[PDB]
């Protein structure tokens with residue numbers, strides 16, 4: 281009636297693989313955690329000819345050798361919900377297949393005949409948990425099921441404390457799209473950035489904060505990315521050309537958005553913690569749009585970057601914006617940002633921003649993300665992000681540039697997007713994200729940027745397909761059901777793997793400071809990282825170059841994590 285086994289969180293259990301999945305029989309799991317850490321696992325279940333109703337998974341408490349308790353309340357077991365994804369990229373003919381990308385709800389599930397269904401297991405180790413080897417069990421029952429399943433779980437909690445994100449130097453930046461969340465939840469224009477809107481922003485922003493999120497995107501012009509996404513990108517700063525004929529700037533949305541992020545502890549502008557990333561002085565395809573009171577219509581202009589028109593406009597804005605930010609106590613964390621723009625384009629922004637100054641001797645910090653590989657010029661950009669496919673693994677150019685930038689107190693990250701492998705798509709193996717984070721440390725960068733926190737298509741919970749990109753590329757979280765009372769978002773295996781990677785690179789860095797006698801050995805481990813090459817599937821999506829490369833991504837991420845935890849054991853053995 282019902283089959284069950286522990287499954288890996290590294291990859292998806294797909295319906296198409298029913299025949300193979302049916303063969304699984306793993307009944308134990310063990311892992312290593314620090315105090316304040318989290319672990320993940322998964323149970324995969326399958327039906328045969330009969331449907332099975334009221335399938336439930338229940339956790340025992342977790343008990344260490346001393347009898348100390350980690351309550352079953354710290355263990356959340358959530359069904360993985362499938363959604364439909366076109367498996368291609370810009371390929372409407374590609375197969376539309378289901379993927380268990382959504383960490384959905386706890387409680388009971390009815391499963392139809394001849395089906396795979398899996399449940400994600402999230403284990404939180406309290407920040408005051410006692411060290412030790414903790415044992416517990418997860419039981420699977422269902423109405424029809426004669427013999428229930430009990431799976432035996434253990435985890436060792438090492439006597440070291442997982443760093444708080446504030447206590448690390450990890451840089452994490454995921455682009456938020458609060459007007460997309462408004463659209464999905466039918467928040468009207470009149471209620472934008474009111475508590476009615478915040479209802480649906482607060483919880484996912486706390487999720488972002490809690491995993492290490494520091495960067496906060498804000499749009500400063502209309503349609504900065506030329507409406508590449510399903511949803512428009514409105515400006516948080518409204519532009520009007522008035523009756524006399526001058527430009528006015530309405531900062532209301534900007535202010536309410538930023539203050540929210542301050543209130544939640546993502547930004548701290550007095551303290552220079554976090555970033556405000558203002559996109560952009562170079563909108564994609566150059567259009568600057570504004571409401572002209574004469575002629576009363578919306579209007580636009582196409583100035584190419586650098587010109588006198590361009591200089592004066594952005595001067596104007598940057599001037600107002602400066603004063604505006606000085607008013608707030610915010611100016612020190614504000615970056616003017618550019619997304620994959622020309623080298624010649626960047627030239628201008630550095631020059632114009634050079635000029636706009638205040639009586640205090642202060643300057644607008646600058647940010648650029650590049651889809652392309654002498655620091656004279658780049659040193660004038662305070663935060664740069666380089667795409668993974670543009671990092672040559674067989675050169676030290678990246679690592680040397682990032683080492684240099686760090687010496688100057690500048691920011692450097694890596695990003696992934698459409699066409700990358702490893703990456704963070706619905707179709708990706710979730711372990712690819714943990715690899716991605718490790719790779720940011722291998723290249724000696726500050727961390728990881730991704731354009732895609734919450735860029736929902738129409739109804740992600742049922743279909744994720746979009747005209748462009750691999751499926752799921754624009755969002756790392758799902759919305760909740762539209763009418764939901766309570767829940768406002770759901771996480772994903774791929775997001776949980778990015779979280780894991782972040783925790784673990786934070787471990788490595790903590791250990792290299794705490795254990796000088798082990799630092800070189802830790803570094804040797806980190807710099808042993810192998811890199812899979814990329815290929816494409818038949819439908820245009822990036823994938824591993826081969827089965828061997830695909831398996832390498834997974835094995836490497838595990839090898840490094842386990843290495844670091846075994847070094848932690850050695851240091852603990854030392855300082856006892």
Ligand SMILES: O=C(N[C@@H]1[C@@H](O)[C@@H](O)[C@@H](CO)O[C@H]1O)C(F)F
Pocket residue numbers: 505508618619620649650651665695696697698699729730731749753
């Ligand atoms: O991710 C970035 N840029 C673009 C995005 O704006 C979007 O086009 C994305 C689609 O996967 O491709 C990224 O390269 C960022 F690195 F600047």
